[PDB]
Design a protein around this ligand. Sequence first.
Ligand SMILES: O=C(O)Cc1ccc(O)c(Cl)c1
Ligand SMILES: O=C(O)Cc1ccc(O)c(Cl)c1
Ligand SMILES: O=C(O)Cc1ccc(O)c(Cl)c1
Lengths: 219, 214
Amino acid sequence: DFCGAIIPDNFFPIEKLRNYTQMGLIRDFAKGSAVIMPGEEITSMIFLVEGKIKLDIIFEDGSEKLLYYAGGNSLIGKLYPTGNNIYATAMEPTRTCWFSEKSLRTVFRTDEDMIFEIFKNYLTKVAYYARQVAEMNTYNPTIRILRLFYELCSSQGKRVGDTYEITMPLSQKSIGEITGVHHVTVSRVLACLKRENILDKKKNKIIVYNLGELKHLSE
Amino acid sequence: DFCGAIIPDNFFPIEKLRNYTQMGLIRDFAKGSAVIMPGEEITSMIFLVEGKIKLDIIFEDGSEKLLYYAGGNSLIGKLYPTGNNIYATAMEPTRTCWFSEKSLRTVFRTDEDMIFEIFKNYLTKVAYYARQVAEMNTYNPTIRILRLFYELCSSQGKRVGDTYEITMPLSQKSIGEITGVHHVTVSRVLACLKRENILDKKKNKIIVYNLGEL
Ligand SMILES: O=C(O)Cc1ccc(O)c(Cl)c1
Ligand SMILES: O=C(O)Cc1ccc(O)c(Cl)c1
Ligand SMILES: O=C(O)Cc1ccc(O)c(Cl)c1
């Protein structure tokens, strides 16, 4: 039920939509191709059967920002017009299933539970972005990075000996995209955390040596 | 079906839920009372039958921010736990209707259209906050105040003579709450826009003398 998200990646997946894909339209996308073209008006939920999509917002002046990443069993909830210009691209070969409003009616008539999984998915997203705005108005850049690593360890940290391991690739670029923080500050904070023997943000893994001090510093 | 919003106030109203409130639980709140108490686990959608609610988030250090205002026909979508601490107060006497998951099944088994109205309401909320995150990572505080005014004018501004008039109560305080800007910046921007002959943020109205400039 739990509709929390720490990072804007794989928001509340709904594997069970796989059972309904013959009610929608299968559309495939080569690596680097546009799932949602800039300016295109989308009026379908887009279910990600397999692959990976990066979904950005583009402003009036052409400026572009990450909204989220999506992988297998993710849902793009763009059933109605929103006034935002979205650009979504396939990061690898990607199979999607596009569900119109009418096709969704057929889904819910078959399985009423699908309704509530989609509410979960929407709610996850609201809670994540609403919190993020508030947090950006409350904590400074270094604090946001520390709060991110703390929350991530608290959530996903697996006790390996005297440490917690977070088994994920989280690049410096992505931490910047997520936190809004510029690259030099991201570099500097990561480097201190490692020099202070607190955490070591590696390529394929984050090792937290001293979670109590990360928590303390995040405050 | 338009799911845009400029102001985090009265997100996508669903007046038709008025038809189904006998399927939920009616709860009234006096002015100043908590609809959602800080630290309360909410597992209900809450429909606002009449009145007005200010809905905030609270962080672990007790610091607090506005998420949104809500009036008649508004929906609070907190059906499941989110991990956020939410405090929602009645700004005037307010009648609410709480829908559990169970009761929402009853509603949807009666009228399938209500599922899509709820999707519209959620979508409007995701589109609002997601844009705002990105906006905050792209544009400095002053530019976000100027974007607020321009967007407001070209959606709601009625072309009256030489100027542009937007009929709404938008206080300096709430301009800050929305844009994330400190009160002193908001004053020093607004008193500029009047002095330059571009905008006047009077109490009840907003008069844009030059939209091209804005
Ligand atoms: O990934 C698949 O399920 C099939 C698929 C989809 C999209 C593509 O561009 C390719 Cl090469 C294959
Ligand atoms: O399309 C929008 O404006 C925002 C958005 C983007 C992607 C999604 O999955 C959702 Cl629910 C909304
Ligand atoms: O509960 C949250 O975490 C955020 C939130 C608040 C109010 C709402 O109406 C929704 Cl859909 C989400």
